[PDB]
């Protein structure tokens with residue numbers, strides 16, 4: 001049976017407006033749902049597959065179930081599913097967030113975004129991740145490209161395409177054949193053992209914190225910095241081999257220009273090779289909110 005109500009979003013009233021994002025295996029479009037053909041039509045975001053397969057459709061159904069199960073201020077809102085092509089295809093309907101990805105927003109508006117604002121965003125991402133952990137979901141793709149901006153005071157985790165549910169009797173998920181792997185955000189045990197956990201999401205959150213404090217300045221991204229350290233001329237698996245060796249022996253992304261030492265210390269604590277010594281998302285949210293609260297000028 002259809003996982004969701006197939007009459008809620010009928011394909012003939014869903015009208016394409018603009019492309020919002022696109023990758024090799026999915027895209028998000030801005031559409032208008034206008035069942036009354038009148039001004040009573042809401043703008044929505046629609047995720048669809050690209051280069052679909054039976055495997056990818058099965059994974060997409062799991063992703064939709066994940067998103068529908070989540071209800072939190074810092075997670076993008078599920079609205080429904082459109083069973084298009086005569087109920088022989090699936091598209092995911094979500095709220096439209098007007099300011100787009102945090103990665104682009106930081107670049108466009110860096111001149112109005114100070115440290116306390118970056119820490120507000122950090123707090124909100126952490127709270128979304130606390131919530132995901134209560135469901136035993138591992139996000140596996142935390143990065144500013146996957147955070148969305150509702151307004152100047154509110155961000156939300158925006159995509160769950162790589163999210164996995166932990167098995168019942170263990171605290172890690174072992175990925176067999178990876179698809180897209182954002183290796184410059186990965187914890188060392190994900191690179192060396194294919195193991196993903198709440199603690200590897202904490203590692204990647206440290207990379208997100210780094211990204212925020214770089215303001216996505218040219219040449220400061222995690223891939224650009226890790227490649228500068230490894231050697232730009234390298235290529236292929238040798239890059240991964242060097243990345244593993246670098247991380248195992250305490251090589252790390254640098255402190256961004258202007259970043260306070262206390263915030264860099266949070267990043268470095270997330271980037272602990274000892275999985276069990278990494279802070280929890282609860283620890284991080286409290287620490288960041290206390291930092292913000294103790295600021296006044």
Ligand SMILES: CCS(=O)(=O)N1CC(CC#N)(n2cc(-c3nc(Nc4ccc(C5CCN(C)CC5)c(F)c4)nc4[nH]ccc34)cn2)C1
Pocket residue numbers: 020021022023024025026027028045047076094095096097098099100101104145146147148157158159
């Ligand atoms: C790679 C596989 S993917 O394509 O499926 N993937 C998912 C992916 C990454 C994540 N999360 N994504 C998601 C969305 C998305 N965007 C929006 N609003 C929006 C508004 C405005 C602009 C811009 C702004 C400024 N510029 C210059 C022009 C228009 C915008 F870009 C988006 N609302 C959304 N609600 C739900 C999802 C979503 C967007 N990208 C990417």
